[PDB]
Amino acid sequence: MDISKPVGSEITSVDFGILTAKEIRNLSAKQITNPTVLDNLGHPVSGGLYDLALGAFLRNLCSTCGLDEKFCPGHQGHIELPVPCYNPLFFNQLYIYLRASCLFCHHFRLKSVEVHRYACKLRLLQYGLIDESYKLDEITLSSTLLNELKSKRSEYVDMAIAKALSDGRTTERGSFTATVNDERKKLVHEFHKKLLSRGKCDNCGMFSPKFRKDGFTKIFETALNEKQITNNRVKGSTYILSTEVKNILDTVFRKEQCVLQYVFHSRPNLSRKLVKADSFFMDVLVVPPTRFRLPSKVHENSQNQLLSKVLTTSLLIRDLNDDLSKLQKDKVSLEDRRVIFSRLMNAFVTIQNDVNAFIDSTKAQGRTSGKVPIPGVKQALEKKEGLFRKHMMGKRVNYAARSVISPDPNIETNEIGVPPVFAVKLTYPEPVTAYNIAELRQAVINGPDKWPGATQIQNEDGSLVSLIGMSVEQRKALANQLLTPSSNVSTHTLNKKVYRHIKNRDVVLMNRQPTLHKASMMGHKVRVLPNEKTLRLHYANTGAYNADFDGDEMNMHFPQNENARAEALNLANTDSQYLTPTSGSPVRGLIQDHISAGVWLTSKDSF
Amino acid sequence: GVHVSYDNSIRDADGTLVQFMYGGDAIDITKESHMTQFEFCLDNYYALLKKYNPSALIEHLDVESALKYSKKTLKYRKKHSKEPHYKQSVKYDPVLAKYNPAKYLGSVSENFQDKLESFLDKNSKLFKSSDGVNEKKFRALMQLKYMRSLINPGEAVGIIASQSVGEPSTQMTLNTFHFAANVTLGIPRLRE
Amino acid sequence: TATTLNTPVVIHATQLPQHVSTDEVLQFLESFIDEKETNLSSSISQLKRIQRDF
Amino acid sequence: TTCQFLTKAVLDNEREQLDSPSARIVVGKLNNVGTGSFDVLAKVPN
Amino acid sequence: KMQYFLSTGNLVSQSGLDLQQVSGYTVVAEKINFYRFISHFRMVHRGSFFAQLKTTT
Amino acid sequence: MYKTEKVDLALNRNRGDPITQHFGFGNDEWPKEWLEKLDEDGLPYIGTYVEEGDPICAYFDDTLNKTKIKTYHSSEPAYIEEVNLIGDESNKFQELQTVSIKYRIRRTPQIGDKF
Amino acid sequence: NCIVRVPIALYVSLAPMYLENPLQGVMKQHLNPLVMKYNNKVGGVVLGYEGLKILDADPLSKEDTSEKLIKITPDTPFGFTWCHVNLYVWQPQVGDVLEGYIFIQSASHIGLLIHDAFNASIKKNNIPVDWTFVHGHWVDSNGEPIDGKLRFTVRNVHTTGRVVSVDGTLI
Amino acid sequence: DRLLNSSDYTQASVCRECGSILTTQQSVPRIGSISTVCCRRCSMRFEDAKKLIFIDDSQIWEDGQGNKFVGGNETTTVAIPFVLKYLDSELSAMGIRLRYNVEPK
Amino acid sequence: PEDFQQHEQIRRKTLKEKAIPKDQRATTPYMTKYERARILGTRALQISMNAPVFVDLEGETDPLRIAMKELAEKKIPLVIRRYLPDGSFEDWSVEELIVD
RNA sequence: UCGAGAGGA
């Protein structure tokens, strides 16, 4: 955090787009195809995983940006896959759109009129028009009158949405709430449920076979019925690859902007981009930068082991399917196909399954049971050991002291007792202006260990000049130029930040874990109690915190800006937390000795 | 993010509306302690007078607009009482439902107003011959006391409503004084 | 690098630019030196040899 | 569950306008309830 | 290998030894006082699998 | 309280690798202040007040002309109880390589001690 | 003819030391350090500024209601306001024949100073066949000396360095 | 002041034009120049810029290994936690492009 | 310059359609606790960064106490922009409010 | 960097 440098811009909203390989190949900086991560010398070998163009290193520099590792954010690479591979996130949707497609007409199996009306309903569900989304079922009157039906439905939807956009019902970019989302999810679930039943085609009457998967990757193609093959020849069990599936679903999606501009976009699509099957399929694995894959300092990163397995399979296929094609198609004829092409039905398992283990590590291949299977990218996000509930929600912070707590009824109920350990250690950044020159000259003169004092001085240029090694006359000389500013053009509107000690003016936060309710965390004015180590309080607080004194510990958080210390004194101080909002009842009054004192003192026989 | 907005409505983050008034009265649960303690607030009257300062709250506060409406609501209320709620049809709105309770002095919830008028019914002798305290002055004090003790626009009442149910569940001892059939009790009931 | 308080954050254009005549140069760009009596002083010290030749 | 709800969130091209506290803590701008339910502006002379 | 078994506790078996758990057989005999050290030689229990089970009989 | 630190220099050798780092000093220049806590055979004297960062063992490297030194680990100012020197269970083809220092830390009754 | 005027809508940050004179605050904070500099959004060199009309975040305010509300950042005390202002930009695009200043004629280069603003350095191969240096002055295809001023074309605008490098050939 | 301004306050920089935090590196200047921030996705190759009226030398910048690029100028500095950048680089391996719509446009 | 000026007028029109004049404001003139805290904090940061102090403080180094002293005569030039849920914002100055 | 154990509230 800083105050001398204000944050100029402002993040407003977050969109969830998809990288495809056309974006990634223009995007990335280095292709990674080499398992030679480090040589026998130990140096980074280019083309490999710890390449110098994917960021800096310890003694090295970056080949892409050319800066030191303090200033290099790292750049991301792309593994050119041999085969278009399934993205293991998007797999069941691909399984739905493949199992509910017609191989011949390259539309869906279901009839086109129902597809057009689900398109119109899910277009009405983008401007929130649920007033019109059920009026459309009341439009019902062959070969050509159905075209008039679809044209009249389309112009009905057009006039409805144009009327709603003419007045102030809906703004330019739609409206999307919980009611809209509930109706949309229910309709899309009913749509994909109806698509899985109509096996016989409603556009040609032909037959596409049933699919059934084993685990994740294997797709057994079930043999047809006798009458279905008969009906196929009247109108006129097998593993299947991903390139055939890519071609089938691409040919489906190129004919189907209509309904899939509306299933896959719950907003008014401004730029009107298309729906490819390339969103489902992967062509480049984007390898993260250097500073997110560094080893422990020594064990290397286990992400690099799975990237090395993927590149081992990638170099096996660069061996085989490049060095077999240069061979003749006549000499490689009969007995060179029951072994070599029994290996491409075994080397595509290991390019798909290793990307699966790289991302969705549950779907994998078995083994004799060992220590620990390696986590993926999904496994580094999901739980308390993940990322959201471990590094975005629950963080470990600076400027937060901790000790044991102690009784002290000689300090007020809004006061905290600070031992001089923490009175020396924790600092606060006050600026320098002539209303606060006396205490800051005296604080720099007193130095890092004579409380009230100061440990650091931040210049107008942002340099943290520390006062630790400096002598007595190398602190008394600095307070004679804090007052005079510089002739700098950029920083004639700033002042030096003296990082003074915590003193009797400040206020901390206090926090006892676990916090079952919001009265277990308050704000306390500061008293520094000399020559101790424990933090200590009055007894009014010790019913709110559920605190006995058999060794309890509390996290004194010391806020660093003027905003929070202006909010810890008004909105969360102890004087505004008397009544808990559970029942409006008090929880803060005196305890054990004071009650039997008040019984004896207020009794009639005390003269 | 479920909180209190400037239209005094319990509205979520984007704008999904959960309630129209907080609980029925837009009051704060902390600051509603001695409001229905009328016998207490009759006493200490000058203390609350110098506390509340009504004379500095004249110009920025439309006074009698809700006061004319509220007496008509109450007379139509006592006009039709013995009929049940399905026979008791609705003619016009309650006092808070039409007028903003933090801008119109006298826009008061119905049950608090009923307890106020019943207390001022049954204890006229305490008003008459104790300190000469006027009934109209006491009523026009409690109309300000109901308005100063109102919930703030901005308070995260969703967090508070979560924590005031999650925390007393920790006081539930797992043994059950059940036998006398049976019924699911405690956190096995509150999670269900 | 420079911060968010020396040179402004976002600069766009509102209208396409339009030329000025020779005699309309010194309507303010002469009184700019008549009123301000390196980033400001050498500015006009080099403007003495730019706008005068027109 | 993240990747189920993340799977659903990509397959809608879901714009998110940073409404809830959790999303405004992940992005880190300000939180809506309490103090951040309004803004502050400054009158100046001329 | 027997020193590895006593140094970590992770039982490496080819037949499971007709037990339930895998880890946690050896505990470090601490000597902070004589009571803690004399305690460890009379410390018996059911198992380490039952500590995760939430039904408490 | 009795701590123990088992400092050895056999962490970078395998299969008869020659002794790279010897206990003691070398014949270069070196800051001369290290003698206040260290004997001239690398080891510290018994019973020495050592705060944070002050040396606990010194070794002369043979390679880089460096007398690289072991610094004190924690922050509690301890006293040197023992300096024990373990020989090698091989046929002593190596020199001294294992020093198991003890440390003594005072525990006065202080504010917070759970009686 | 390259003294052009352009209206721009910039977006300045205002310091709390000038919450009482924001006109001179932005004139000293952002506009003065844009004098005699290249800019990536106008492509020119700014000579003068006029017409600082700061917008207001009050949509119902006027030009005489000078209660100019300026928005405060949630963390820092700095303001961020929109402004419309006219600039006197000097910029060539391709080959503008304008007069020049020469301090010393030299042998392998010439070194024109463009009206005491920037440089117009001329390389080796840009010196033609007829022009050769003599041992500093030039005897060109005329054979007689000329005035100290010199007109010259514009080749390319190079803004990577500390100043703008403008090249020009003389054919 | 307890979950952003202490732990991992990272005043990063986003391209305004494409909206991604991960990409926009530093430029590599010549000696006697300055190094600004330029994007990578929106910036395009210098070898493809001569497709066509004449191109001024403004969008042209250079990387470390010498591949001259054209464009990608629109970047500006925001303030995010660093775990946001770690999240973006963890999601890009799954094939997801977060876009960060940033005003002032 | 056509498209940017066009979108500028678009955004200013969509903001002015939300702006509510002083003939209509249906919010209470009591400062809540939150508005008092943020006004004291923001005036503390402004006085901390060389603002002209509108009070003659008598030996004060805490800038928050300088802000709490300037509120006594309402010499705090700030304006609260109260946000209704659809962005329809009202302007209340500090010197038009019931300071509680 | 991960598992096993000990202990405080």
Added chain:
DNA sequence: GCTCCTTCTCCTTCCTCTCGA
């Protein structure tokens, strides 16, 4: 065309230390 009896396919308090890979 419609329905039920199995699967898949899911998910959950703060702190300190040591031991060992």
Added chain:
DNA sequence: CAGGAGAAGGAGC
């Protein structure tokens, strides 16, 4: 060692 819950497909209705 839970603890039921949601979704899905063919064997009967």
